[PDB]
Design an enzyme around this catalytic site. Sequence first.
Site: not given
Ligand SMILES: O=P(O)(O)O[C@@H]1[C@@H](O)[C@H](O)[C@H](O)[C@H](O)[C@H]1OP(=O)(O)O
Ligand SMILES: [Ca+2]
Length: 513
Positions: A112-113, A142, A144, A157, A191
């Site tokens: 995650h992240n 992940e 972003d 982030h 994302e």
């Molecule tokens: O990749 P997803 O499944 O969307 O989940 C992410 C999550 O893993 C992480 O970035 C959260 O900080 C964030 O809130 C969320 O995105 P969000 O802004 O849609 O809640």
């Molecule tokens: Ca993320």
Amino acid sequence: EIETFYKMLTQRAEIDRAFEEAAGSAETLSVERLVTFLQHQQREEEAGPALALSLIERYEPSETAKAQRQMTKDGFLMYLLSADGNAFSLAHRRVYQDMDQPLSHYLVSSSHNTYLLEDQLTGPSSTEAYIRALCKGCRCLELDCWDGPNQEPIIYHGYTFTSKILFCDVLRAIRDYAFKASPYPVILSLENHCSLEQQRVMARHLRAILGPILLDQPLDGVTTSLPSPEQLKGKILLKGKKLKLVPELSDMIIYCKSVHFGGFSSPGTSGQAFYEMASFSESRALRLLQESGNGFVRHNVSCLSRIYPAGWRTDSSNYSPVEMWNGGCQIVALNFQTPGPEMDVYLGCFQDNGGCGYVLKPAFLRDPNTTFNSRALTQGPWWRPERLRVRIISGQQLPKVNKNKNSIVDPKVIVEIHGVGRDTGSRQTAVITNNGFNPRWDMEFEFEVTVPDLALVRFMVEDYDSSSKNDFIGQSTIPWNSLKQGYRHVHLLSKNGDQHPSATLFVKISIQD
Ligand SMILES: O=P(O)(O)O[C@@H]1[C@@H](O)[C@H](O)[C@H](O)[C@H](O)[C@H]1OP(=O)(O)O
Ligand SMILES: [Ca+2]
Ligand SMILES: [Ca+2]
């Protein structure tokens, strides 16, 4: 003396006794006795002269006894400390399960992240973070993405002060390490927050950099279910929104379309397509697990769910994955950079199946028509109580948990059962003061576990502090089905998941229905 020392520093009674008991009076273990040991004690199924022979061939130090198909105490000891004497099944330490069902049937190691090395607010990001994860077996990563200077997309982030890095740079690292630890598919969770321009750029980099690794077209056949880890072996798939979103990108999302949680279609035929994926935060997930355990499970049978740490965990702390796995959730995302029991269980879980990153769910979690619900337990195949008796015998060369001085450790051991709630238990031994070299506890605990197929057993050693906390010294998590019986050594791990060469616990495990 000097012999008497190496002889006496190096002298473990528990082992003597064990050898004694096995060999009786002989100064040696004949295959006939070895096998009796292998069967009566180590409870091996493949117990037979074949095994016993390989043990001796592999571990017997004495050329005589070796040649003469016998095992001396030393050889006994070595076996016991070998990959064969390990509490964590050697056999399970290589891909050994069905890699043919659709992905939805496996627990997938997810991060995650991933780009983060620290906290979610202002810590740093680095490609190293993806390398590490990947090296630790992680399959699902992940990214972003945000627009960056000079038309180059960056990753960091969204809305925080976390340091930044390049989308491209990340892509190479992934390209380089995606398969170091396993041949199975890696999933990229995009994302997107990129302008259409930079979005296309992204799409270029993907194609440019992932090249053929990238999976950009449905698999011939693959019509009703998700492909299997086998089918996708060697590929990297994308997960994201599918048609603000340029086609270049969107056209690459084949089996992982991000979707908002619809609901579970038992009150109908379908809901989410096998190729659609929903994500749920910790909290929500719990709620649905609390209210619709069976829904979720059944859902998860053919669909991939992704869960991710709660928003307040700005410290990249993690939640327990077991709870979700118990609901059949497969892309249970954790903050891989954060040491703690949660990553301990996570990585323990994934050491199974040769740590390829994919672990087959139990059958009852792969049956679309299942009445299972870890929260409202009823009789089912999943219901199969076992009685675990673990004897914490002694500890060997427990590592000096730093400490800014020359003090001795004061160890104690905790054993814990992780699985359905009914099965969760924890027990601890006494503290041996001032001994890390060869503390001996000889304490035994017993646990009843109704759903072994979802259990994990964890051994942790803390250095006791009357005053302060209790320094973690090492730990080890073994999935129930890889738990080996008899006399075994538990090879301890540092907080970072690294192997501690000579740190072990010596135990006697027995499991009976
Ligand atoms: O990749 P997803 O499944 O969307 O989940 C992410 C999550 O893993 C992480 O970035 C959260 O900080 C964030 O809130 C969320 O995105 P969000 O802004 O849609 O809640
Ligand atoms: Ca993320
Ligand atoms: Ca001490």
